[PDB]
Coordinates of C-alpha atoms and ligand atoms in Angstrom, one line a residue:
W37 CA 0.0 -0.1 0.1
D38 CA 1.7 3.3 -1.3
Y39 CA -0.3 5.9 0.6
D40 CA 1.6 8.2 -2.0
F41 CA -0.7 6.3 -4.4
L42 CA -3.8 6.3 -2.3
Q43 CA -3.7 10.2 -2.0
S44 CA -3.8 9.9 -5.8
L45 CA -7.2 8.0 -5.9
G46 CA -10.5 9.8 -5.7
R47 CA -8.9 12.8 -7.8
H48 CA -9.6 11.1 -11.2
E53 CA -17.7 8.4 -15.9
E54 CA -21.4 8.4 -16.7
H55 CA -23.0 5.2 -16.6
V56 CA -25.7 6.5 -14.2
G57 CA -28.5 6.7 -16.7
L58 CA -28.0 3.2 -17.7
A59 CA -27.8 2.3 -14.0
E60 CA -31.2 3.9 -13.5
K61 CA -32.6 2.0 -16.3
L62 CA -31.3 -1.3 -15.3
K63 CA -32.5 -0.4 -11.6
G64 CA -36.0 0.1 -12.9
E65 CA -35.8 -3.2 -14.9
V66 CA -34.5 -5.1 -11.8
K67 CA -37.2 -3.5 -9.7
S68 CA -39.9 -4.6 -12.1
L69 CA -38.5 -8.0 -12.0
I70 CA -38.7 -7.9 -8.1
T71 CA -42.3 -6.7 -8.5
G72 CA -42.8 -9.2 -11.3
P73 CA -44.9 -12.5 -11.5
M74 CA -42.3 -14.7 -10.3
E75 CA -43.3 -18.2 -9.5
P76 CA -42.4 -18.3 -5.8
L77 CA -39.3 -20.4 -5.6
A78 CA -37.9 -18.4 -8.5
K79 CA -38.7 -15.2 -6.7
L80 CA -37.0 -16.2 -3.6
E81 CA -33.8 -17.3 -5.6
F82 CA -33.9 -13.9 -7.5
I83 CA -34.3 -12.0 -4.2
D84 CA -31.5 -13.8 -2.5
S85 CA -29.6 -13.3 -5.6
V86 CA -30.1 -9.5 -5.3
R87 CA -28.9 -9.7 -1.8
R88 CA -25.8 -11.7 -2.2
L89 CA -24.8 -9.2 -5.1
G90 CA -25.0 -6.4 -2.6
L91 CA -27.9 -4.6 -4.0
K92 CA -30.5 -5.0 -1.1
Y93 CA -29.9 -1.3 -0.2
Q94 CA -31.3 -0.3 -3.6
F95 CA -34.6 -2.5 -3.4
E96 CA -35.4 -2.5 0.4
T97 CA -39.0 -2.0 0.1
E98 CA -39.8 -4.1 -3.0
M99 CA -37.8 -7.1 -1.3
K100 CA -39.7 -6.8 1.9
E101 CA -43.0 -6.5 0.2
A102 CA -42.3 -9.5 -2.0
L103 CA -41.3 -11.7 0.9
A104 CA -44.2 -10.4 2.8
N105 CA -46.7 -11.5 0.2
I106 CA -44.7 -14.9 -0.3
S107 CA -45.1 -15.5 3.4
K108 CA -48.9 -14.8 3.1
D109 CA -49.7 -16.7 0.2
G110 CA -52.4 -19.5 0.6
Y111 CA -50.6 -22.6 -0.2
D112 CA -47.2 -24.2 0.7
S113 CA -47.1 -27.0 -2.1
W114 CA -44.3 -25.1 -3.8
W115 CA -41.7 -25.7 -1.0
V116 CA -43.0 -28.4 1.3
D117 CA -41.1 -31.7 0.6
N118 CA -38.4 -29.5 -1.1
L119 CA -35.4 -29.0 1.2
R120 CA -33.8 -26.3 -1.0
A121 CA -37.1 -24.3 -1.1
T122 CA -38.0 -25.0 2.4
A123 CA -34.5 -23.8 3.8
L124 CA -34.4 -20.8 1.5
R125 CA -37.9 -19.7 2.5
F126 CA -36.9 -20.2 6.1
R127 CA -33.9 -18.2 5.8
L128 CA -35.3 -15.2 3.7
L129 CA -38.4 -14.9 5.7
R130 CA -36.5 -15.1 9.0
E131 CA -34.1 -12.5 7.7
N132 CA -37.1 -10.2 6.7
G133 CA -38.4 -10.3 10.2
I134 CA -41.1 -12.9 9.5
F135 CA -40.9 -15.9 11.9
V136 CA -40.8 -19.3 10.5
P137 CA -40.6 -22.3 12.9
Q138 CA -37.8 -25.0 13.0
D139 CA -40.7 -27.5 12.6
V140 CA -40.4 -27.1 8.7
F141 CA -37.3 -29.3 8.7
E142 CA -38.8 -32.1 10.8
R143 CA -40.1 -33.8 7.6
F144 CA -36.5 -34.2 6.5
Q145 CA -35.6 -36.1 9.6
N146 CA -35.8 -39.7 10.7
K147 CA -39.1 -39.1 12.8
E148 CA -37.8 -41.3 15.7
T149 CA -34.1 -40.2 16.3
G150 CA -34.4 -36.6 15.1
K151 CA -31.4 -37.0 12.7
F152 CA -31.6 -35.8 9.2
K153 CA -31.9 -38.5 6.7
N154 CA -28.4 -39.5 5.4
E155 CA -29.6 -39.8 1.9
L156 CA -30.0 -35.9 1.7
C157 CA -26.1 -36.2 0.7
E158 CA -27.5 -36.6 -3.0
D159 CA -28.8 -33.1 -2.8
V160 CA -25.8 -30.6 -2.5
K161 CA -28.0 -27.5 -3.1
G162 CA -30.5 -28.5 -0.6
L163 CA -27.6 -29.2 2.0
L164 CA -26.1 -25.9 1.3
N165 CA -29.6 -24.2 1.8
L166 CA -30.0 -26.0 5.0
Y167 CA -26.5 -25.1 6.1
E168 CA -27.0 -21.3 5.3
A169 CA -30.5 -21.2 6.9
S170 CA -29.3 -23.0 10.1
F171 CA -27.4 -19.8 11.1
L172 CA -30.7 -17.9 11.5
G173 CA -31.5 -19.9 14.4
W174 CA -32.2 -18.8 18.0
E175 CA -31.2 -20.5 21.6
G176 CA -33.2 -23.5 22.2
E177 CA -33.7 -24.5 18.4
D178 CA -32.3 -27.7 18.6
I179 CA -33.4 -28.7 15.1
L180 CA -31.4 -26.0 13.7
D181 CA -28.3 -26.9 15.7
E182 CA -28.6 -30.4 14.3
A183 CA -29.0 -29.0 10.8
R184 CA -25.6 -27.1 11.2
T185 CA -23.8 -30.0 12.4
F186 CA -25.3 -32.4 9.8
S187 CA -25.1 -30.3 6.8
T188 CA -21.4 -29.1 7.6
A189 CA -20.4 -32.7 8.0
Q190 CA -22.2 -33.9 4.7
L191 CA -20.9 -30.8 2.9
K192 CA -17.3 -31.5 3.9
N193 CA -17.9 -35.2 3.1
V194 CA -18.9 -34.6 -0.5
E195 CA -16.8 -31.5 -1.4
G196 CA -14.1 -33.8 -2.9
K197 CA -16.6 -35.6 -4.8
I198 CA -18.2 -32.6 -6.4
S199 CA -16.8 -32.2 -10.3
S200 CA -18.6 -29.0 -10.8
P201 CA -15.8 -26.6 -10.1
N202 CA -18.3 -23.8 -9.8
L203 CA -20.4 -25.8 -7.2
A204 CA -17.3 -26.9 -5.3
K205 CA -16.4 -23.4 -5.1
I206 CA -19.7 -22.5 -3.6
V207 CA -19.5 -25.3 -0.9
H208 CA -15.9 -24.5 0.0
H209 CA -16.8 -20.9 0.4
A210 CA -20.0 -21.7 2.5
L211 CA -17.7 -24.1 4.7
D212 CA -15.4 -21.3 5.2
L213 CA -18.0 -18.7 6.4
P214 CA -22.0 -19.0 6.1
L215 CA -23.6 -16.2 4.2
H216 CA -25.1 -14.8 7.4
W217 CA -21.8 -13.9 8.9
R218 CA -20.2 -12.7 5.7
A219 CA -19.4 -9.0 5.1
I220 CA -21.8 -7.5 2.4
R221 CA -19.5 -5.7 0.1
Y222 CA -16.6 -8.4 -0.2
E223 CA -19.2 -11.1 -0.6
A224 CA -20.7 -9.0 -3.4
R225 CA -17.5 -8.8 -5.1
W226 CA -17.1 -12.6 -4.8
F227 CA -20.7 -13.6 -5.8
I228 CA -20.6 -11.3 -9.0
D229 CA -18.2 -13.7 -10.6
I230 CA -19.8 -16.7 -9.1
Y231 CA -23.4 -15.7 -10.2
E232 CA -22.2 -15.1 -13.8
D233 CA -21.9 -18.9 -14.2
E234 CA -25.0 -19.8 -12.4
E235 CA -27.7 -21.8 -14.2
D236 CA -30.8 -19.5 -14.0
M237 CA -28.5 -16.5 -14.3
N238 CA -30.3 -13.3 -15.1
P239 CA -27.9 -10.9 -17.2
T240 CA -30.0 -7.6 -16.4
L241 CA -29.3 -8.4 -12.8
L242 CA -25.6 -9.1 -13.2
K243 CA -24.9 -6.1 -15.4
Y244 CA -26.6 -3.9 -12.9
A245 CA -24.7 -5.6 -10.1
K246 CA -21.4 -4.8 -12.0
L247 CA -22.2 -1.1 -12.7
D248 CA -23.5 -0.3 -9.4
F249 CA -20.5 -1.9 -7.8
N250 CA -18.0 0.4 -9.9
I251 CA -20.2 3.5 -8.9
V252 CA -20.0 2.7 -5.4
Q253 CA -16.4 1.9 -5.7
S254 CA -15.8 5.4 -7.2
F255 CA -17.3 6.9 -3.9
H256 CA -15.1 4.7 -2.0
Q257 CA -12.0 5.7 -3.8
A258 CA -12.5 9.5 -3.3
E259 CA -13.2 8.6 0.5
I260 CA -9.7 6.8 0.6
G261 CA -8.0 9.8 -1.0
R262 CA -9.3 12.1 1.7
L263 CA -8.6 9.7 4.5
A264 CA -5.1 9.1 3.5
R265 CA -4.5 13.0 2.9
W266 CA -5.7 13.3 6.6
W267 CA -3.8 10.4 7.9
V268 CA -0.5 11.7 6.3
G269 CA -1.4 15.1 8.0
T270 CA -1.6 13.5 11.4
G271 CA 2.0 12.0 10.8
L272 CA 0.8 8.9 12.5
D273 CA 1.8 6.7 9.4
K274 CA 5.5 7.3 10.4
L275 CA 5.2 5.8 14.0
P276 CA 7.8 3.1 14.1
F277 CA 6.1 1.1 16.9
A278 CA 2.5 1.6 16.0
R279 CA 0.6 -0.2 13.2
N280 CA -0.1 1.9 10.0
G281 CA -3.8 1.1 10.1
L282 CA -5.7 3.6 8.0
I283 CA -6.6 1.3 5.1
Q284 CA -7.4 -1.5 7.6
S285 CA -9.8 0.7 9.5
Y286 CA -11.3 1.9 6.4
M287 CA -11.7 -1.9 5.2
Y288 CA -13.5 -2.5 8.6
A289 CA -15.6 0.5 8.0
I290 CA -16.6 -0.7 4.6
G291 CA -17.8 -3.9 6.3
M292 CA -19.6 -1.9 8.7
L293 CA -21.2 0.4 6.1
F294 CA -20.7 0.6 2.2
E295 CA -23.5 2.9 1.0
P296 CA -22.4 6.1 -0.6
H297 CA -25.1 8.0 1.1
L298 CA -23.3 7.2 4.4
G299 CA -19.9 8.2 3.1
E300 CA -19.1 10.9 5.7
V301 CA -20.2 8.6 8.5
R302 CA -17.8 6.1 7.2
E303 CA -15.0 8.4 6.9
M304 CA -15.3 9.4 10.7
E305 CA -15.8 5.8 11.6
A306 CA -12.6 5.1 9.6
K307 CA -10.8 7.9 11.4
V308 CA -11.8 6.4 14.8
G309 CA -10.8 2.9 13.9
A310 CA -7.3 4.2 12.7
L311 CA -6.8 5.9 16.0
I312 CA -8.0 2.8 18.0
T313 CA -5.4 0.6 16.2
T314 CA -2.8 3.4 16.9
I315 CA -3.6 3.9 20.6
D316 CA -4.0 0.2 21.4
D317 CA -0.5 -0.3 20.2
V318 CA 0.6 2.7 22.4
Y319 CA -0.9 0.6 25.2
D320 CA 0.3 -2.8 23.8
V321 CA 3.6 -2.0 22.3
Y322 CA 5.6 0.9 23.1
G323 CA 4.6 2.8 26.3
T324 CA 5.7 3.1 29.9
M325 CA 2.9 2.6 32.5
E326 CA 3.7 6.2 33.8
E327 CA 3.4 7.3 30.1
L328 CA 0.0 5.2 29.9
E329 CA -1.3 6.2 33.2
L330 CA -0.9 9.9 32.1
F331 CA -2.5 9.2 28.8
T332 CA -5.6 7.9 30.5
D333 CA -5.6 10.7 33.2
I334 CA -5.5 13.3 30.4
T335 CA -8.2 11.5 28.4
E336 CA -10.5 11.0 31.4
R337 CA -10.1 14.7 32.2
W338 CA -10.3 15.9 28.5
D339 CA -7.5 18.4 29.4
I340 CA -4.2 18.5 27.2
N341 CA -2.6 21.1 29.5
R342 CA -0.1 18.6 30.7
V343 CA 0.5 16.8 27.3
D344 CA 3.9 18.2 26.8
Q345 CA 5.4 15.7 29.6
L346 CA 4.9 12.9 27.1
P347 CA 7.3 12.0 24.3
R348 CA 6.1 13.4 21.0
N349 CA 5.7 9.9 19.7
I350 CA 2.9 9.6 22.1
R351 CA 2.0 13.2 22.4
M352 CA 1.0 12.8 18.5
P353 CA -1.4 9.9 18.8
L354 CA -2.8 11.6 22.1
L355 CA -3.5 14.8 20.4
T356 CA -4.7 13.3 17.1
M357 CA -7.3 11.3 19.2
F358 CA -8.2 14.5 20.9
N359 CA -8.5 16.7 17.9
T360 CA -10.4 14.0 15.9
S361 CA -12.8 13.5 18.7
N362 CA -13.5 17.2 18.9
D363 CA -13.9 17.4 15.3
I364 CA -16.5 14.6 15.2
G365 CA -18.4 16.0 18.1
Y366 CA -18.5 19.3 16.4
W367 CA -19.7 17.7 13.1
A368 CA -22.6 16.4 15.3
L369 CA -23.1 19.8 16.9
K370 CA -23.2 21.5 13.4
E371 CA -25.1 19.0 11.2
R372 CA -27.4 17.5 13.9
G373 CA -27.7 20.2 16.4
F374 CA -26.2 18.2 19.2
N375 CA -22.6 18.5 20.8
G376 CA -21.2 14.9 20.4
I377 CA -17.8 16.0 22.0
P378 CA -19.0 14.7 25.7
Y379 CA -19.7 11.4 24.2
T380 CA -16.5 10.8 22.1
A381 CA -14.6 11.8 25.1
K382 CA -16.7 9.4 27.2
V383 CA -16.1 6.4 24.9
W384 CA -12.4 7.2 24.6
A385 CA -12.0 7.5 28.3
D386 CA -13.8 4.1 28.8
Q387 CA -11.8 2.5 26.1
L388 CA -8.7 3.8 27.6
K389 CA -9.8 2.5 31.2
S390 CA -10.3 -0.9 29.6
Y391 CA -6.8 -0.7 28.1
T392 CA -5.4 0.3 31.6
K393 CA -7.1 -2.6 33.4
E394 CA -5.6 -4.9 30.8
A395 CA -2.1 -3.5 31.0
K396 CA -2.3 -3.4 34.9
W397 CA -3.5 -7.1 34.8
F398 CA -0.5 -8.2 32.7
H399 CA 2.0 -6.3 35.1
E400 CA 0.4 -7.9 37.9
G401 CA 0.4 -11.2 36.4
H402 CA -3.4 -11.5 37.0
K403 CA -5.3 -14.4 35.3
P404 CA -9.1 -13.4 35.1
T405 CA -11.9 -15.8 34.2
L406 CA -13.3 -15.8 31.0
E407 CA -16.3 -13.8 32.0
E408 CA -14.3 -11.0 33.8
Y409 CA -11.9 -10.9 30.7
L410 CA -14.8 -10.5 28.4
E411 CA -16.6 -7.9 30.5
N412 CA -13.4 -5.8 30.1
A413 CA -12.5 -7.1 26.7
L414 CA -16.0 -6.1 24.9
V415 CA -15.0 -2.6 25.7
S416 CA -11.2 -2.9 24.7
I417 CA -12.1 -4.2 21.3
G418 CA -13.2 -0.7 20.6
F419 CA -16.8 -1.4 19.0
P420 CA -18.5 0.3 21.8
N421 CA -16.6 3.5 20.7
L422 CA -17.2 2.9 17.0
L423 CA -21.0 1.9 17.5
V424 CA -21.7 4.9 20.1
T425 CA -20.1 7.0 17.4
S426 CA -22.4 5.9 14.4
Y427 CA -25.3 6.1 16.6
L428 CA -24.4 9.8 17.6
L429 CA -23.8 10.6 13.9
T430 CA -27.0 9.0 12.5
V431 CA -29.9 9.0 15.1
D432 CA -32.8 11.3 14.5
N433 CA -33.0 14.1 17.2
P434 CA -30.2 13.1 19.4
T435 CA -30.5 13.6 23.1
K436 CA -28.6 12.9 26.4
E437 CA -31.0 10.1 27.0
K438 CA -30.8 8.3 23.8
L439 CA -26.9 8.5 24.0
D440 CA -26.9 7.3 27.6
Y441 CA -29.0 4.3 26.6
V442 CA -26.8 3.1 23.8
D443 CA -23.6 3.8 25.7
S444 CA -25.0 1.6 28.5
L445 CA -24.7 -1.2 26.1
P446 CA -27.9 -3.1 25.9
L447 CA -28.0 -6.6 24.9
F448 CA -28.2 -6.1 21.4
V449 CA -25.2 -3.7 21.2
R450 CA -23.4 -5.7 24.1
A451 CA -23.7 -9.0 22.1
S452 CA -22.3 -7.4 18.8
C453 CA -19.3 -6.0 20.9
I454 CA -18.7 -9.4 22.5
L455 CA -18.7 -11.0 19.2
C456 CA -16.2 -8.7 17.9
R457 CA -13.9 -9.3 20.7
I458 CA -14.1 -13.1 20.8
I459 CA -13.8 -13.4 16.9
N460 CA -10.5 -11.2 17.2
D461 CA -9.4 -13.4 19.9
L462 CA -10.0 -16.6 17.8
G463 CA -8.2 -14.9 15.0
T464 CA -5.2 -14.0 17.1
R471 CA 3.3 -10.6 20.3
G472 CA 1.6 -8.5 23.0
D473 CA -0.7 -9.6 25.9
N474 CA -1.4 -13.3 25.7
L475 CA -4.3 -13.0 28.0
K476 CA -7.2 -13.6 25.2
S477 CA -10.2 -15.6 25.4
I478 CA -8.9 -19.0 24.8
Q479 CA -6.1 -18.8 27.3
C480 CA -8.4 -17.1 29.9
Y481 CA -10.7 -20.1 29.4
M482 CA -7.8 -22.7 29.7
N483 CA -6.6 -21.0 33.1
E484 CA -10.3 -21.1 34.1
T485 CA -11.2 -24.8 33.4
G486 CA -7.6 -26.4 32.8
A487 CA -9.1 -27.2 29.4
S488 CA -7.1 -28.1 26.5
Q489 CA -6.0 -25.6 23.8
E490 CA -8.5 -27.2 21.1
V491 CA -11.2 -27.6 23.8
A492 CA -11.1 -24.1 24.7
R493 CA -11.1 -22.9 21.1
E494 CA -14.2 -25.2 20.3
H495 CA -15.8 -23.6 23.5
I496 CA -15.0 -20.1 22.1
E497 CA -16.4 -20.8 18.7
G498 CA -19.6 -22.1 20.6
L499 CA -19.8 -18.9 22.2
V500 CA -19.6 -17.2 18.8
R501 CA -22.6 -19.3 17.8
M502 CA -24.5 -18.4 21.0
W503 CA -24.1 -14.7 20.8
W504 CA -25.0 -14.9 17.1
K505 CA -28.2 -16.6 18.0
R506 CA -28.9 -13.7 20.6
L507 CA -28.4 -11.3 18.0
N508 CA -30.7 -13.1 15.7
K509 CA -33.5 -13.0 18.6
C510 CA -32.5 -9.4 19.3
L511 CA -33.5 -8.4 15.7
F512 CA -36.9 -9.9 16.3
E513 CA -37.5 -7.9 19.3
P514 CA -38.8 -4.4 19.9
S515 CA -36.1 -1.9 20.4
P516 CA -35.8 2.0 20.3
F517 CA -33.0 1.4 17.5
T518 CA -33.9 1.7 13.8
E519 CA -32.6 0.7 10.4
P520 CA -29.1 2.1 9.9
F521 CA -27.9 1.5 13.4
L522 CA -29.4 -2.1 13.4
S523 CA -27.3 -2.9 10.2
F524 CA -24.1 -1.2 11.8
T525 CA -24.5 -3.5 14.7
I526 CA -24.8 -6.7 12.7
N527 CA -22.2 -5.6 10.1
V528 CA -19.5 -4.8 12.7
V529 CA -19.5 -8.6 13.4
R530 CA -19.5 -9.5 9.9
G531 CA -16.4 -7.4 9.3
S532 CA -14.7 -8.9 12.2
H533 CA -15.4 -12.3 10.6
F534 CA -14.0 -10.9 7.4
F535 CA -10.6 -10.1 9.0
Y536 CA -10.0 -12.8 11.6
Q537 CA -11.0 -15.8 9.6
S547 CA -1.8 -10.4 3.6
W548 CA -4.9 -12.1 2.0
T549 CA -6.9 -9.0 3.3
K550 CA -4.6 -6.9 1.3
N551 CA -5.7 -8.3 -2.1
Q552 CA -9.5 -8.3 -0.8
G553 CA -8.8 -4.5 -0.5
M554 CA -7.4 -4.5 -4.2
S555 CA -10.3 -6.4 -5.7
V556 CA -12.9 -4.4 -3.8
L557 CA -11.5 -0.8 -3.4
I558 CA -9.0 -0.5 -6.3
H559 CA -9.8 -2.4 -9.6
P560 CA -13.0 -1.7 -11.2
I561 CA -14.9 -4.4 -12.8
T562 CA -14.5 -4.5 -16.6
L563 CA -17.9 -4.3 -18.5
Ligands
LIG601 C1 -11.2 -0.9 13.7 C2 -11.2 -1.2 15.3 C3 -11.0 -2.5 15.7 C4 -9.5 -3.1 15.1 C5 -8.8 -4.0 16.1 N1 -8.2 -3.1 17.2 C6 -6.9 -3.0 16.8 C7 -8.5 -3.8 18.5 C8 -7.1 -4.0 19.0 C9 -6.9 -5.4 19.2 O1 -8.1 -6.2 18.8 P1 -5.7 -6.2 18.1 O2 -5.4 -7.7 18.2 O3 -4.4 -5.7 18.9 O4 -5.7 -5.7 16.9 P2 -6.6 -6.0 21.1 O5 -6.8 -7.5 21.3 O6 -5.3 -5.7 21.4 O7 -7.7 -5.3 21.9
LIG602 MG1 -3.4 -5.0 20.6
LIG603 MG1 -4.6 -4.4 23.2
LIG604 MG1 -4.6 -8.3 20.7

């Protein structure tokens, strides 16, 4: 990554009329007659190509009327149709019971019938649908285990390279857990080779992708300029994480109309990865204690006591925090500086508890560690910032409620932390080793336990999305998509993902 070259991008196309024509056509298709299984497959194709943000209402209405049609003959007895309907309806907020899978099980033992290994597409759809489940839905747990076992069994026996690629991709990460934009870039190429491929939808996908990528490149140019202006790229003992943070933010939100929010999120992310290193890599406890005190008091009057290599990240945090709070004051009429200050103070207190534990040789339980680490991962900061920047009529009360980390937000933060600990030269007190110290458990027993925690908290997020809350569409999607971006990173192979998504356009 030549940041010299990324300041280039965004400085330097009219396909927008054809884009609007293709959008009207795809929209008519979504409203079109569409025998119901074909309509489901089309809606799911539109989603996988990253186009749901264009056709929100049409997709919702189409799925709502599919749910309310008078007859079930078109999907019952059909595993692919049953699973796809389950998943899409339950993604749309329309509950479907797990009972619909019982007719594919041996009615005595509850096991899915081994003969289903003859239906690869149905197995894939059952697999994908299983990750829409909640706690206590045992049929969906069984569906996950069975489908994964069978798919890995037959992956070597599949001779269609396209379907082998799809099966391998699903085994890497289920669709429910995948970052939308990167998955869209992958599935454009995949969809171009599918059986019932619709060329109108494919062309619109490619064109819309290039346009959104143009917005992204302008954003990257501005952010690289700012980041060089901070001088933080030239820190020897701190990660140069501007482009990594922007990739995180793309996973969190990719819509062009949210661009400015992205930039701020990106900024915060960068600073997070810098300050963490200040706390994890190169910093005296006296230096970090002073860092934390200054941040808690929001008072930079004694900042010159710090060496300039620490003084620059601290003051960049300070000034960017004030800038974002003032953006809130100006554009939303609400001074957000106290809340950016609060979230940074809380995150530095979490960093401080972690560093103090290390120096003390403390070995916390997994629960204690996680209580601190859902904050130290930084996503309370990022999510409260996104809420500040996007909520209608911001108030002290709304901000206090979101910053209290209710179950929905707290589950997303926990997931980000434990996913990063599964993906992880620093502080070796992470999730796995905390559990090992707790229970004396094995390396791999602890790892599988943490993976089970991943599944459990995803179940809780799924059930949260069905339950009333004072949160609305954009923040909802933010909360899910930070977990998806975490899955994206801690599965450089991430570098070439950035090249394919943010740098190179799609040839048309
Ligand atoms: C974009 C904001 C999240 C990016 C990841 N941050 C660096 C978190 C820091 C960590 O996760 P990292 O593993 O050091 O990257 P930590 O485990 O030290 O808390
Ligand atoms: Mg770290
Ligand atoms: Mg750390
Ligand atoms: Mg770490």
